[PDB]
Design an enzyme around this catalytic site. Structure first.
Site, PDB file in Angstrom:
ATOM      1  N   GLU A   1       5.591   0.930  -0.802  1.00  0.00           N
ATOM      2  CA  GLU A   1       4.805  -0.258  -1.217  1.00  0.00           C
ATOM      3  C   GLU A   1       3.568  -0.388  -0.344  1.00  0.00           C
ATOM      4  O   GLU A   1       3.616  -0.115   0.868  1.00  0.00           O
ATOM      5  CB  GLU A   1       5.660  -1.534  -1.067  1.00  0.00           C
ATOM      6  CG  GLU A   1       4.845  -2.896  -1.121  1.00  0.00           C
ATOM      7  CD  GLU A   1       5.715  -4.109  -1.180  1.00  0.00           C
ATOM      8  OE1 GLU A   1       6.963  -3.967  -1.255  1.00  0.00           O
ATOM      9  OE2 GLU A   1       5.178  -5.268  -1.150  1.00  0.00           O
TER      10      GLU A   1
ATOM     11  N   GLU B   1      -2.281  -8.950   1.312  1.00  0.00           N
ATOM     12  CA  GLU B   1      -1.663 -10.258   1.220  1.00  0.00           C
ATOM     13  C   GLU B   1      -2.535 -11.314   1.929  1.00  0.00           C
ATOM     14  O   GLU B   1      -3.000 -11.112   3.091  1.00  0.00           O
ATOM     15  CB  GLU B   1      -0.281 -10.235   1.890  1.00  0.00           C
ATOM     16  CG  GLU B   1       0.745  -9.555   0.970  1.00  0.00           C
ATOM     17  CD  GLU B   1       2.103  -9.431   1.639  1.00  0.00           C
ATOM     18  OE1 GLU B   1       2.210  -8.828   2.706  1.00  0.00           O
ATOM     19  OE2 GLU B   1       3.083  -9.946   1.104  1.00  0.00           O
TER      20      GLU B   1
END
Length: 219
Positions: free
Chosen positions: A107, A111
């Site tokens: 992943e 963010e």
């Protein structure tokens, strides 16, 4: 079922909806919301994720996660977006695969911690091991207007971009396995030191204009 190895462009003002899935379940983990499809909507050329109170569910909040059906390999991933600003939440744009796909948890995350939207956080996982949180100072407020953000993912590195400019390289434990491109918005739980404690304030929204993948190039 072929990994996508050709350019992919989804501009949310006008795009093939059929390439995407809205989540309709709870991610669990540190996420204190359930995903509902109702929380992914479209207006003003944008895809909107709306975090809002949830009534009589098992979670106190509902929000949105929008996910490609296709998996994508090495190459340059770009989003243009405007984060939500609030203590205790995250707005994101990332790639993910894991055990759903008989895959390792590989992943790459970009963010925006709601508690401070002058910063963007980069992270990534390989085989389920993260620990790469790097906070970059943007020199502007990510919640104030749209900007573009991206990474060129390659076998040995991940190069992070803000507004078409490379600002960082990670080299430790780089993921290997093609993932789905995803965006979500959530209030955190059990992670106060990292995100602040979530306010309980609603509605909140993050807005996205596009997502582009280039198998070949960078800016």
């Amino acid at each position: 079922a072929t990994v996508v190895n050709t350019p992919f462009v989804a501009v949310f003002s006008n795009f093939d909806s059929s390439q995407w899935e809205k989540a309709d379940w709870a991610n669990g983990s540190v996420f204190n919301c359930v995903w509902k499809p109702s929380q992914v909507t479209f207006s003003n050329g944008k895809m909107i994720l709306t975090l809002d109170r949830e009534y009589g569910g098992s979670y106190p909040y509902k929000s949105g996660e929008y996910r490609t059906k296709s998996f994508f390999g090495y190459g340059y991933y770009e989003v243009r977006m405007k984060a939500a600003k609030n203590v205790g939440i995250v707005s994101s744009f990332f790639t993910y695969t894991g055990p759903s796909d008989n895959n390792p948890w590989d992943e790459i995350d970009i963010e925006f911690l709601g508690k401070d939207t002058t910063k963007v956080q980069f992270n990534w996982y390989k085989n389920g091991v993260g620990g790469n949180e790097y906070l970059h100072n943007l020199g502007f407020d990510a919640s104030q207007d749209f900007h573009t953000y991206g990474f060129e993912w390659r076998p040995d590195y991940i190069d992070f971009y803000v507004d078409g400019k490379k600002v960082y390289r990670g080299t430790r434990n780089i993921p290997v396995t093609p993932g789905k491109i995803m965006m979500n918005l959530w209030p955190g739980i059990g992670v106060d030191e990292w995100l602040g404690r979530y306010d309980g304030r609603t509605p909140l929204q993050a807005e996205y204009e596009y997502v582009k993948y280039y198998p070949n190039g960078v800016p």
